Amino acid sequence: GFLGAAGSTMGAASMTLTVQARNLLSGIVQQQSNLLRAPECQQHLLKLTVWGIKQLQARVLAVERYLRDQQLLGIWGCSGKLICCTNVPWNSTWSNRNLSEIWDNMTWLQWDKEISNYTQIIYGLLEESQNQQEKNEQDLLALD
């Protein structure tokens, strides 16, 4: 089930990350194309101008949000991965506790609530780190 892992511990929930990632786009295509089986539904619903516009705004936004998250992972050098490890050290200010307490016997919902406003700091750090890595690769490849 799509949110079935919500009550699982962080290190257990992480076993099934793929299903949440898939639902974000697969649900859109199936709901708009495969669910809309009766041709008379679209013909009639196109007469409701306001519903037509509202539903498009919802689809377009879902796409825009999907892409924004993917662009961000790309910038950080996590493209194509569900699990990405990077070279930004963890600061105890964000969370000071054992990695046993954090990964296991605690859920992701609880975790997100605890990190809270530290998220913006982390994102800025991740972006700078990747830029330094790209420059270093470009220079090494010029040395032969």
Add this chain to the structure above:
Amino acid sequence: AVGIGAVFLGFLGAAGSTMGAASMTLTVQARNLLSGIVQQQSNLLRAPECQQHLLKLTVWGIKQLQARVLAVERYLRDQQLLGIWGCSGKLICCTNVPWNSTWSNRNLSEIWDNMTWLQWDKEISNYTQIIYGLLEESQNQQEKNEQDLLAL
């Protein structure tokens, strides 16, 4: 004289070629799905008067807009699958899922030299979902294994 040279005359020119030969045009059939959209929209700037007129037809406007949105959504769906299977960014991707003779029992020379892609996807049609599921499982295992090596 035929079979000498891999030039195809346009967008679906390789449709009647064998599976091997057709690999030469994978770029051509990939770019079109997205770049075609942008050019069709660019072309409306050749007639600003047309664009102004078309906004007066609510139904035509919405139907075309829906078509564009759906085309994008299908594109992204397929790209996400390449991501999930670990093939993102490639036109050709080798995976670790072994081939089952059940899905199709043919020699490689038979497939690549005598079958066309329009035949191939009918013979293997019944196994499409099976294969996709297997590709996902394989990638899931690979990513957790990499995390453990980095940890060690």
Add this chain to the structure above:
Amino acid sequence: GFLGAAGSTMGAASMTLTVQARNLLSGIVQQQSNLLRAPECQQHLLKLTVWGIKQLQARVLAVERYLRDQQLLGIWGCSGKLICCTNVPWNSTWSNRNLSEIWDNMTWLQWDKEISNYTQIIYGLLEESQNQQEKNEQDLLALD
């Protein structure tokens, strides 16, 4: 700042690639989230059928253009990077300047005008190089 590098030389300007890349999508999402601060015209503006359609067309097109550039980087084998090197050699016919006159003493706006006529040629060469590289990897992995 965004485009603050416009007067910088090409070398210095490479340190702001992140800023321009993010704005392509982040501005779209923020522009939509900003109207949640005044919900009353979210409803009123749906009556302006013409504005409804024009704004969606603007958003849809922005997405299509973004994706076109990303697909192209993917085809060239540069997915996920802001800076990538290829195997296509530089042709002195495209430009015969010294690196000392390109990465210094000149801005990106000036450069773009200087080599505008060769853009399509370069892109075609990049695509061919990547096709050969993928075929070579496919063959190498079959020799295991």
Add this chain to the structure above:
Amino acid sequence: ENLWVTVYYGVPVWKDAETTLFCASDAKAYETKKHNVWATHCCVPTDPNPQEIHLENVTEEFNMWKNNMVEQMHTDIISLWDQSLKPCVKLTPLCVTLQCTNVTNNITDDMRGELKNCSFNMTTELRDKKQKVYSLFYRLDVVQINNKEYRLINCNTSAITQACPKVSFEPIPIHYCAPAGFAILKCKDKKFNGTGPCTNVSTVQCTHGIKPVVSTQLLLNGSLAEEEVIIRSENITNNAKNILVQLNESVQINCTRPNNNTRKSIRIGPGQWFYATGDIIGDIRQAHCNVSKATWNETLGKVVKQLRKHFGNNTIIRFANSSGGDLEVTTHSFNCGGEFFYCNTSGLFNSTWISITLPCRIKQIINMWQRIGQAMYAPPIQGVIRCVSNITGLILTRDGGSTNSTTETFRPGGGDMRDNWRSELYKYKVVKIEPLGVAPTRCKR
């Protein structure tokens, strides 16, 4: 020691959010009734076997009084209603001086003066010709000018649109479905009061079907409580709030309009028809509703018990009838069989704690959403109408203002349609999924 920041995508977490929900119905269930406004505009089918995922050890906060699902349902119902009536005949040619007399033929004393026989000069297809026609109007729709000259009640205030004669407004279950990227959380706690944390939370794709029943004072054909009567309000102490009471066992109510009407079709213009009330066959008798007395008495006893828990064990609780005001809020309203019954509920709320026949009236020209300027004329329904409905809940107000709260008095209220919705959507909340998260790991790149 030496842990690094890692990024996980596909993290199963969420935040409160407001989005557009799509309307879906069980397609087989419309049974070809494509003239039902609710089916034709909620065309998209639901999935067979809607799934529910229990979320073990997930606690979530619900608040039915700030739930935007209600506001969205309200807005969409009004919108569909208006679109349904858009492509139909206007009755502006009908706003003429009427010459009326009393209907006195075989009529009971109970309706003397209730119906009027009005004749008038109305148009025909050719502009040049006029025709003399007549119709029987209910008194509530006709107003005296300056004792024989009358006008329809809305000639000064608004235009009247005749409802489309083939369109049904019969409620069908409607399911609200989240768009991808969103999920609906359902609270299944028993004795849930509408605002606290919910212990048993599950995830669903769509809500259960809710019938968009329109009523005042009493709520018909809704959900029942499973343990006991549940009383919910935004603020109990504040007498300005409505109190929504959900019953655990339904009370059956049997309503009828005994008069046998014949409908008369009148041409009013090129392709335009008006539906008149014709004449009545047989005796003229009052419309009425029957509520089992014993069941109603038991029902109040349960409601009172729960009110005592909040208002005190030695507190006297009195029920009384509604205050004055617009007919639409002082009486009960059915919208059943295609006729708009306005019923007098005083017989249900006349007791002090420490079969019942309710007379009804019919009104043809109405303003359902409390809006002024858009009036609908209901075409007559032929033959005899009988409806049997389930009373599933009540909307009550408390007078307040008493000295030292010695006793309390409750009266039927409601009238704001949002509360009819809140009574069904209190178990659902919409959340946005936010898949990107960060956590420490024993790894380095």
Add this chain to the structure above:
Amino acid sequence: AENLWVTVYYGVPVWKDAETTLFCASDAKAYETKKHNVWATHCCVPTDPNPQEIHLENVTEEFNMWKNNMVEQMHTDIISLWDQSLKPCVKLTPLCVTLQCTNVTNNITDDMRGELKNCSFNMTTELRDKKQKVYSLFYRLDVVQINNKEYRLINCNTSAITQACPKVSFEPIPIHYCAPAGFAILKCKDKKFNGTGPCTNVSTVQCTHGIKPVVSTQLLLNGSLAEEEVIIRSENITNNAKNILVQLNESVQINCTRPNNNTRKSIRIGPGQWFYATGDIIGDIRQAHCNVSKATWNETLGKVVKQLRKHFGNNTIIRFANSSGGDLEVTTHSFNCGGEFFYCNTSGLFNSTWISITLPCRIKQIINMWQRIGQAMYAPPIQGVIRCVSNITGLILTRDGGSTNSTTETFRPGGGDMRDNWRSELYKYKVVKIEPLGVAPTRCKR
């Protein structure tokens, strides 16, 4: 263990049948400084001046013209264009009045006796306080007697009649239907393609050939020709409930005229609204008519018989009849020459048994388009004299069905909805959706 592995390819040249929304394009110069045009103004998107086709060698696709969604789309689009062009126009509700009519007896040939009526009536003026007495001529077909001088317009007991805006031309221009990205249109080039079956020589195109949206009921005008043989294309040739939809390999011509010299009387009816009435006729009054050459018609009918016999036998009798049943929309040949609506009697074309021809025509002004009754259109009068020559490129015929299973079978002119005219031009095209992702075995692994 064989050691074959799954390889994923993207950009694979395959497709599946699909239904999408095509867009309507026109020639960037088809404007011709003309914008009042029902086709050009809406299908305003300019096309590619240098269209290209890709021959797909070694491709054998199945095409089915009877289940072709492209046809359904044009049917929907043409009606819509029609309805959105008559929208910002005069509603003529003020004309639904009692008319006082007499016969036009001035300079009338016998064939026109009783055909035209002179009607006087009281209608509105710029001010709502004033009425004016005006008169106009009407064709008998549009005026009905109220229970013999009082008449009304024929549609007063059904619907409002709007006036078509006088500036808009309905003259068909070629239209190109174009695929959205991700879709492609496949075209069948088999010279004798029958329909409903495999086609070799398949080509990929972006846009269809230009098609003129010509509306007619029996003879198909200004379409494409067959190149080698007359081709008979039906869904089911033995089912008399179906249509034989003949296509000819040579065109024949039909010369149509409305010989009367008309004037138009322009009447103000309200605050910015004008009504166009038929004024007095200059010169004498004669009936509308259309010519075909007799020998030419016989020769093409004979060609049809030779081909038609291929499905019935070489010792069978093919008889043609003048057709029957329904109102003028399905009994006569309608075609709108010059903007006026002609309804021609074709019995003279189907009067032979196989084993110059003048067709009289009537003119109607109040038109119920597309077999609907909800709305009607009033066609403003056209001044002067109308003449055109059209190319007959095909026929819609039906079979009566056999009775007693005798030697003779009868082919009678048909009629039907607009969809058949569309099938006549769209029989060559199919829309498919491209699906670039696929899998095949190779010898490589990670």
Add this chain to the structure above:
Amino acid sequence: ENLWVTVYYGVPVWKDAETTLFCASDAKAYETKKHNVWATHCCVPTDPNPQEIHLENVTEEFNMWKNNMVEQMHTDIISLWDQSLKPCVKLTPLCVTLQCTNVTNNITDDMRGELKNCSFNMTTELRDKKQKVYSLFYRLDVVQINNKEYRLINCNTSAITQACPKVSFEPIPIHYCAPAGFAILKCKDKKFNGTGPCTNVSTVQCTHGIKPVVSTQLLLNGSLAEEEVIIRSENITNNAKNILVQLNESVQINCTRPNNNTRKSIRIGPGQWFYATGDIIGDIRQAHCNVSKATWNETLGKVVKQLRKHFGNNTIIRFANSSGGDLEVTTHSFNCGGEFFYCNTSGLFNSTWISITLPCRIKQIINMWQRIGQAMYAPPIQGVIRCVSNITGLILTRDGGSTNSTTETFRPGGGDMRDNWRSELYKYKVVKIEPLGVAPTRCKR
């Protein structure tokens, strides 16, 4: 050489482009003005702190005469206007014969014959009744039939719609904002005359606030030049091009409609009202505008010196009144308090170079955008109207005619609304961002 192609994404490069800009007004400015056309259809909040990024060493070419921002503003303002008048009362029922006499009560000579008293037969709420009503009209709204009978001027061209009385047209500054993927560049150069490069440019996400003032001949409430009067034109040489003059100082103009008018409401059909002008309470005097003489004389002299730089030093420069034509172009035109004024400016442009009272006339039937098929009826505004405006610019036309001996004559011009917009949008340009590019480096895979 041993160099290779390197691909870079996020390159700070742009190209000229045409896109759709969106409207955003300040949020606090909204107040409760849901009835103000500019606030209700542009509530999208602006950034409370717009940013400006100065670009060092960037010299872009700007061309105000061939911009796109101007055309969009023109198109959008017309659309908003049309959608504001859409859900309003049609006055078709007023196109009747009027029985008119002159208003002769306490009239100063200035308005003798300007205002007429008209009575007429109008519809009412029932179709069977008529009422006799009367109202006052200005003589430009009423035209004689063939001799006391008159009709409204628009009866033989188009139906007229009454603007809804609660709706305000008072200008509220709006800002145009680029959609993501685009940027707006702005000139900071002083003495920039358009059509050429700017040395000092910056990037902004939104334009400054622009008041959508609709007026002719003189430009009111715009921006002032920082240092000198600036004369801009597409071709200073060509007599067919308008000259837009921007002032550095501001001339204050005081406008009034001294008459104390009464509004009266007449019901014309169900739910519909017509708002008519009733009797005037006090004396009847003409509308007028005052311009300080000395200030105007100095301002004009400054304009002349700048013209003198473009033309010969020994040129005799003359100003004269506008050539004939429609009132909308021969007189000054503006909306003050909601009523429409047309003023005689011959008192401002009557001089040769080597307090001024402008009489005004009021008209209620307005063809605001010079579109023959539409018209709007301005409801009267109760009471006395006064406003004070800032004259910030002029539209002049050189009379030309190839007049010899260097005696150029300028006359007020206008009527192309785009030219008012061009006086605020001249400093802005829209460009698109194009992030990919390549360059040689010595890096290889």
